[PDB]
Design a protein around this ligand. Structure first.
Ligand SMILES: Cn1ccnc1CCO[C@H](c1cc2nccc(C(=O)O)c2[nH]1)c1ccccc1Cl
Ligand SMILES: [Mn+2]
Length: 293
């Protein structure tokens, strides 16, 4: 049987008034969004920050990802441009059609088939170990390292600029993700059970799955039961390097799971102790940071 898509997580389209303060808005949506673990936030139509990374010098060596590495129980340097050419060529060749014509439901169905396939070994690459300190943030930042036009200053000062989120807990910079088709991140929660906010600067959508915090123990129970026994006794911080699991398996065991396709220009917020995972539909560029309330 083919993959059954989970129900859609909440999507919010705040007015310009509601968009004034992120923490205030997230606090207001909390009664609903914390019951779904993840939610999507569409900024007002005219809110479009520029892309502010140093594209000329952007170079990275992505990690290699074997989709079926659990069921089965190298390095290339790219620029942003050459990675995008590799990514589009991979997807268009795999589906035998232009990249933008591949339905999101098909990539989703094919991704989870490949994760459990023993007869087909598909290998992709993910630019996932990129700090915003290396080549700059995707958002404009008034740090003097790169020019900012007057029309872009409001985005350098915006509270939705991930560089302006509060990160100090009572008793940290954004990270970048250059994705291709089938590149993925497995089930995990954040350190200190922190919130996280994620912005897709451009490219094809990023598909998400989320579990509300009230079902965190249920997920971890299903994991220890079905995860490889060799990795059963591993600490959570190490096990969550390989906590790959089909969302339908969690749903069969009574774990509530919600999905969304995060498109370019949209935010995804993960709530405290909300397990989440996902994959990229194609060539895209995301920025993420953990924040405190
Ligand atoms: C936290 N965590 C757990 C295990 N390892 C880590 C550290 C590297 O975390 C990344 C990661 C976390 C994340 N959260 C939201 C969105 C994305 C995205 O890619 O858009 C994310 N990517 C990661 C974890 C597991 C497997 C692969 C990768 Cl790339
Ligand atoms: Mn995360």
């Amino acid at each position: 049987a083919e993959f059954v898509p989970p129900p859609e997580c909440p999507v919010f389209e705040p007015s310009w008034e509601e968009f004034t303060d992120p923490l205030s808005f997230i606090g207001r949506i909390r009664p609903l969004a914390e019951k779904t673990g993840i939610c999507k936030i569409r900024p007002p139509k005219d809110w479009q920050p520029p892309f502010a990374c140093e594209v000329k010098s952007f170079r990275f060596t992505p990690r290699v990802q074997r989709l079926n590495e659990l069921e089965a129980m190298a390095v290339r340097e790219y620029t942003l441009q050459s990675f995008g050419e590799m990514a589009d060529n991979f997807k268009s060749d795999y589906f035998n059609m232009p990249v933008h014509m591949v339905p999101t439901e098909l990539v989703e169905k094919e991704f989870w088939r490949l994760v459990s396939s023993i007869e087909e070994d598909v290998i992709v690459e993910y630019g996932a170990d990129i700090s915003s300190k290396d080549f700059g943030s995707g958002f404009p930042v008034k740090d003097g390292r790169r020019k900012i036009l007057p029309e872009e200053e409001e985005y350098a000062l915006s509270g939705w600029n991930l560089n302006n989120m509060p990160v100090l807990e009572q008793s940290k910079v954004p990270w970048l993700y250059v994705g291709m088709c089938f590149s993925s991140f497995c089930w995990h929660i954040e350190d200190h059970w922190s919130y996280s906010i994620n912005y897709l600067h451009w490219g094809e959508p990023k598909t998400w799955y989320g579990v509300p915090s009230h079902a965190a123990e249920q997920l971890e129970e299903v994991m220890r039961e079905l995860a490889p026994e060799l990795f059963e006794s591993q600490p959570d911080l190490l096990h969550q390097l390989v906590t790959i699991m089909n969302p339908n398996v969690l749903m069969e065991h009574g774990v509530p799971v919600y999905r969304t396709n995060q498109c370019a220009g949209e935010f995804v917020v993960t709530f405290p102790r909300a397990y989440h995972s996902g994959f990229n539909q194609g060539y895209n560029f995301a920025e993420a940071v953990n924040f405190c309330t």
